[PDB]
Design a protein around this ligand. Sequence first.
Ligand code: A1EHF
Ligand code: A1EHF
Length: 147
Amino acid sequence: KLPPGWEKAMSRSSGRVYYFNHITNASQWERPSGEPARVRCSHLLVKHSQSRRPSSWRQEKITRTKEEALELINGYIQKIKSGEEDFESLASQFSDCSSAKARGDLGAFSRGQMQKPFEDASFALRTGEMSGPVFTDSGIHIILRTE
Ligand SMILES: Cc1csc(C(N)=O)c1
Ligand SMILES: Cc1csc(C(N)=O)c1
């Protein structure tokens, strides 16, 4: 029916159908459009106190809870989707990954290199597409597939 990971859902607040991807946690009103050796992705990471290292260039000791990290991620996604902020700008300012200094760009990678939920979401995104919150042992990610 739909591309890998996508399913129909019902808006609780509006009653309109929408589409949700259970690999990428992307959600959108529009029906999804229409695998490679490598993809290229950027990401914005928000770490939390349960991260496998709760420390970053932004903060020596990351103390925010997982729930607080998710609320930050949710807010960044809202600003990206509304156009108020660009993904690259938010990643440079707020990603707890050292790749923040490269606007979140991780370069290209194959399957079997990244943490699995990140890999699966990255490969389920089409070029240009953005994930919803993706959970790994590092923290919570917004992933943007660029190639
Ligand atoms: C909403 C929510 C996200 S993480 C979380 C928890 N209890 O760790 C709750
Ligand atoms: C992919 C990447 C670019 S900068 C960086 C770092 N400095 O750790 C990671």
